[PDB]
Amino acid sequence: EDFDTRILEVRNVFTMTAKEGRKKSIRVLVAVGNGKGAAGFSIGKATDRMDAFRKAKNRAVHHLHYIERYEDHTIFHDISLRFKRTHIKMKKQPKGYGLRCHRAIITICRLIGIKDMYAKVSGSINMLSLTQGLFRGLSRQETHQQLADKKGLHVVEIREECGPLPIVVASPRGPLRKDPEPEDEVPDVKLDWEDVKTAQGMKRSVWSNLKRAAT
RNA sequence: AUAGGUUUGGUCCUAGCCUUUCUAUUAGCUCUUAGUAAGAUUACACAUGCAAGCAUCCCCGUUCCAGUGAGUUCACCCUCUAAAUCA
Ligand SMILES: [K+]
Ligand SMILES: [K+]
Ligand SMILES: [K+]
Ligand SMILES: [K+]
Ligand SMILES: [Mg+2]
């Protein structure tokens, strides 16, 4: 009773049979989630649409991921991934930002319990790949605690709204290293041109930052 | 772009086209009030009226303002140095 189901896609797939010719089947993608991190998805197939809905709904609950939510409202860090030909680039956002993402990601996020996030889907906009990719990235996100333990260092959060106050969000449960992490003068990191282009005010889009209903 | 529709018996990939947003002109139909802003398609031809005077005569001004977008890297910086203002 805690879990809620929401349809993502309904497709009329067809095969050819010797006796009848075109045989119509229903392929249904559904996502189930209780809103507290536990969410899954499944594909249900049946000649009747009701049977397809049921099969997908009941099978999705046996394939539940657990999503680590930072402060139970957003992701811990920005996740960029490619699943097959679909690119999903998700950004961590502050409280009150909303779900500025593809309608399907909005639906899945509400089931997971993420309230604030931005995501841009590029490449193929296949619904199967998007869902499978979204759950792949969110499942693999590293929490602040896991980072502190791996690095043996404090994770200190700097917030602009709190000035210079150092907020320690995670500390290493084991021994704390005494050597500071080597500060590379120039980071050899791969930058997304779309990010850099926006930061330099070089991106004019009439469709970006349009006023939309509360999500 | 938070995207959407569309190739096929069907699936996936790629791809073009189109949809949704925001402005400006024109057309159809329709139209109550007030304030404000803006306002020939045409460097085609133009009836008529007006748009430059001032002032003890000399001078000064009419080389400005206003208009248009035909032509088109004459517009910017540096160097140098006329005219002009500082009786
Ligand atoms: K397309
Ligand atoms: K009209
Ligand atoms: K005079
Ligand atoms: K011109
Ligand atoms: Mg001189």
Swiss-Prot record:
Molecular function per GO: RNA binding; structural constituent of ribosome
Record carries keyword Mitochondrion: yes
A cellular component term, taken from the record's GO annotations: mitochondrion
Keywords: Mitochondrion, Ribonucleoprotein, Ribosomal protein
Location of this chain's protein in the cell: Mitochondrion
Gene Ontology biological process terms from the UniProt entry: mitochondrial translation; translation
Top-level taxon in the UniProt lineage: Eukaryota
Subunit architecture: Component of the mitochondrial small ribosomal subunit (mt-SSU). Mature mammalian 55S mitochondrial ribosomes consist of a small (28S) and a large (39S) subunit. The 28S small subunit contains a 12S ribosomal RNA (12S mt-rRNA) and 30 different proteins. The 39S large subunit contains a 16S rRNA (16S mt-rRNA), a copy of mitochondrial valine transfer RNA (mt-tRNA(Val)), which plays an integral structural role, and 52 different proteins.
UniProt family annotation: Belongs to the universal ribosomal protein uS5 family.
Name of the protein: Small ribosomal subunit protein uS5m
Protein's organism: Homo sapiens
Gene: MRPS5
Full-sequence range covered: 216 to 430 of 430
